[PDB]
């Protein structure tokens, strides 16, 4: 049937939320890096 | 008078800003417009801002309009209102900016924020260059940033050179001058030195600092070759060990294979290595291989 | 063909006529008044064409 | 303000050599492995 | 047409071919001043009785104009200075030239 | 005196003004308006305001007319009814602006918001630059900027170049006299003053700052290099050491390879440096090599 | 005598004033009417209004007339009737305006009403400018603008050149002149004045002030640099600090870095730069590095 | 403005500024002084130990 309910091929949330970076560390620099992997 | 000339303060530093702008007023040395459509574009966009639309689609060569890259360099401790110097640039197709006015530009940080804005008339030299110039005063600071100036007890000088024997000798100055325990050095290129706590007494510690004397020691015996320019510098300290030398054409003023006499001083260096008649040229080459045997007893760096 | 290269340039200089000399070998050269004038050494013009 | 100045020619010299790329006609071959291409374009 | 070094000079024939950019040069690569450009893909050129040209697309409906070819004009034609390659550059004798679209 | 010559006040400062316009008066020596079709528009904007509406579509080919950028700045503390000093941009293939008039033109700031008015004769030089002229007295201030000028008890003395003896040198002074808590240095470019609350004491009290005299104190040693217009300055810090420099067709008035002798002073470096005989366009590789090796003690900046 | 040289008075101020017009009477000398289209519909409508329709879609080629703006200067506290000087601008293809005369024409304001009527003879020079003209006496003043001059008891003085020596100078001596609290300084730019209330006896306080003596204090020392025409001009502020110079083909009259002397006051600033034997042109240069090393105590203007 | 990476291609300085080429001498290359300024630090373990 059409109206049984099955589950797609892709599961789960299709969108992400961007995150806030974080507050830049009052140096006296302009270029500001987040932590990097 | 002399630690201020050997040395930083940790969070007094520049950075650097960048932005886009138009250049008008050119007797006619400005883009061929037919390609580089930024600059109709962005032309385009300016008299749309002012009350103006052209209609797109349509015919437009200019001639005393030029598309430039304006840079400044953000300085310690700016406050808003204050001037700065800016450097224009060409970056299409353009012919000289000399009697240009560069019109209201902001200059952004890297992350894109604007932190001044540019507005002034430029100085082209006038071979010289025609597609570069400087305006004086051509920018005033909009932003300023946050700083922890001020706060703790501890600033750090940073030696612009590394060297063991320079940071003992800044440390024991300021530790005569300045009361027992005040500095310590934590490696080659640092020195940490306490200060009362507070704005205005930091301020006083860092004036009596700044102009202090210090006696510089013996530094690396080096010699810089730069082959772009054509050129050799030796410093006080390289020495020489007796050897033969052989190339091209020279000769003894006797065969081709002459003496080079040990040296301790730079005269004596001076002195031996004239003796064998080479330009500059040769004694590049033949500066490299005595170091590749053992004769010169120097760094060799080649910039 | 799409790899020609330009590879140098020539230099052309505008004389009168009236104020240079031949030479013994056969070469132009200007006179003392004209080459003090404009100097020991010509500026290649770029009004001239080929 | 002279109404012209004198001047003497020289000769002529064959400067440039074009070609027309035009469309031409088409014959029919009959054969099944010729192509003819229909517009602007060329084979590599 | 733009002479290299940056002055103006005046031609009569025309026999016009395309340069790898796109732009409207003459049999020689003197650039023609009004510097029309025909971008790719031009199926059909098209220059009328007045100086506008207009290039036809795939699927469009109408052509789309890429400029228009105006043409200078002096009060005496006869005092122009005649440099060679077909090509003529004012001087004193001819007067100030104007420009203007063809029929005007 | 000399405080005024060395700092600004924070609050008073300049801003930037921009419009467009049109000059009109020209010896046919204006827009080729079949290529700058914002020139024909704003022309028939101008009539249509002005009570004639020509027909669109029609030919239209002026010579007397240009299209202009003017640019101004907006002075501190400016008043309504004031004037101002214009520049004149040409914006398109215009040969000169040598008589023309400036006609009714609005002048813009950031925001958009129309803060003076610009109309005048234009002064253009008669080489000389004939794409641009300036007008004196040019435009009146219509709009006002508040500010907060006279509110509180405590400003802010900018100095032009950072500097810690120097800021502790301007507040001990204004500390010696106009007594003993007066001044208070925050940064290397900051020295806040404590004034009386009110709008009439603040002026007196930066009336009697403004003109007081400071010794200035000993700056960084420095080498200024232009290569654009080919020039080279050095202050009168500059120290030297001895070492030995060679270069392309330079020899000793010997070899290739000269001697530079130790120079505390500038005198003495001016000479050791004129010993080598060398233009300027030389001078910049050999400094640039010496500071490479340790020679300069100076700081090297290309302007 | 001197404070009418320095200061305005708040609320007297001009404005400008802007129109269309045709000029008759030339020697052929006019418009090309076959493209200016705004000239011959303009005629025709004249020509309507005094009472003659010419069909349209006819033939019509002028050579006398020529189509112009006209622009004015309203004058503080005018009143209808008067007179005021105009100038005429061609603005299409026209040669000269040698003989002409213009015609009837309204002079509009910002807000598109008549000021100002236009009519009388053009006296153009006669290189010079053909292009453009004046008329003296040519406009006369229709209409009148409302003012509050003479309500209050406070007017402002407002200075040409922000200063503060300068304001609290001009309130002393007005305070010195016309009793105890006559005057207040608001700012760098605005002296308030309070004077009785009523017409006339605000004019006798004005006449009064406005020919005081003041004596004026040393202002900033600047260094403005013109490119466009190419000239330098140096107040008499300037200071220099010694330092070396080099620059192409200048040479010691010796090799080619040149020694500059300290000096106080302007004739030893002219001295020690004309002693580097430098044409202006290189001047420029030579004060923008000189500005951004040090030796320079001034500040640079590029105008 | 450009960013200088190492190895692991992590910036490091960021480098601004105006060249200075010699001007036979070489003309594709140029050196800046002071152009570039450290954004990034590495960690030692310089004083540990004996």
């Not at chain 2, 052989?246 to 003023?253: D, E, F, K, W, Y």
């Amino acid at each position: 049937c059409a109206w049984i309910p099955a589950k797609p091929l892709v599961q789960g949330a299709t969108t992400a939320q961007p995150i806030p970076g974080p507050v830049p560390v009052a140096n006296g620099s302009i270029f500001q890096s987040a932590q990097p992997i | 008078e002399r630690i201020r000339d050997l040395t930083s303060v940790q969070g007094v530093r520049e950075n650097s800003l960048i932005g886009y702008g138009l250049v008008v007023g050119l007797d006619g040395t400005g883009d061929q417009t037919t390609q580089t459509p930024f600059t109709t574009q962005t032309l385009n966009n300016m008299l749309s801002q002012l009350g103006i639309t052209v209609p797109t689609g349509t015919n437009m060569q200019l001639k005393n309009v030029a598309a430039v890259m304006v840079t400044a360099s953000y300085p310690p401790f700016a406050r808003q209102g204050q001037t700065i110097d800016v450097v224009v640039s060409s970056m299409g197709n353009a012919k000289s900016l000399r009697g240009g006015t560069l019109l209201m530009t902001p200059l952004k940080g890297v992350d894109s924020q604007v932190y001044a804005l540019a507005q002034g008339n430029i100085l082209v030299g006038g071979v010289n260059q025609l597609n570069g110039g400087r305006i004086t005063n051509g920018a005033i600071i909009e932003r300023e940033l946050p700083t922890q100036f001020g706060a703790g007890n501890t600033i750090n000088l940073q030696l612009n050179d590394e060297d063991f024997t320079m940071a003992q000798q800044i440390t024991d100055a300021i530790n005569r001058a300045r009361g027992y325990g005040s500095a310590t050095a934590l490696d080659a290129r640092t020195v940490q030195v306490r200060v009362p706590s507070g704005n205005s007494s930091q301020v006083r510690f860092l004036a009596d600092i700044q102009n202090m004397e210090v006696n510089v020691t013996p530094q690396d015996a080096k010699v810089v070759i730069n082959s772009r320019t054509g050129s050799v510098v030796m410093n006080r300290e390289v020495t020489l060990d007796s050897c033969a030398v052989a190339q091209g054409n020279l000769s003894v003023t006797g065969g081709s294979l002459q003496s080079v006499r040990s040296s301790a001083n730079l005269n004596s260096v001076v002195r031996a290595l004239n003796a064998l008649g080479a330009t500059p040229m040769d004694l590049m080459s033949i500066l490299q291989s005595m170091q590749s045997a053992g004769c010169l007893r120097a760094k060799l760096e080649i910039i | 063909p799409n790899t020609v290269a330009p590879v140098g340039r020539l230099k052309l200089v505008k004389a009168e006529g009236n104020e240079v000399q031949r030479s013994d070998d056969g070469l132009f050269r200007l006179t003392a008044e004209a080459q003090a004038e404009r100097g020991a050494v010509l500026a290649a013009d770029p009004s001239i064409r080929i | 303000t002279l109404p012209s100045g004198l001047q003497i020619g020289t000769g002529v010299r064959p400067v440039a050599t074009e070609r027309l790329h035009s469309q031409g006609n088409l014959s029919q071959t009959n054969n099944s492995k010729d192509v003819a291409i229909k517009g602007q374009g060329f084979f590599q | 047409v733009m002479l290299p070094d940056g002055t103006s000079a005046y031609t009569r024939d025309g026999s016009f071919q395309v340069d790898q950019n796109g732009q409207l040069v003459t049999a020689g690569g003197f650039q023609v001043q009004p510097a029309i450009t025909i971008p790719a893909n031009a199926l059909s050129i098209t220059i009328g009785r007045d100086g506008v040209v207009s290039v036809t697309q795939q699927g469009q409906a109408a052509p789309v104009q890429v400029g228009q070819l105006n043409l200078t004009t002096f009060m005496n034609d006869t005092g122009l200075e005649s440099i060679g390659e077909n090509l003529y550059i004012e001087t004193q004798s001819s007067g100030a030239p104007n420009e203007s679209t063809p029929g005007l």
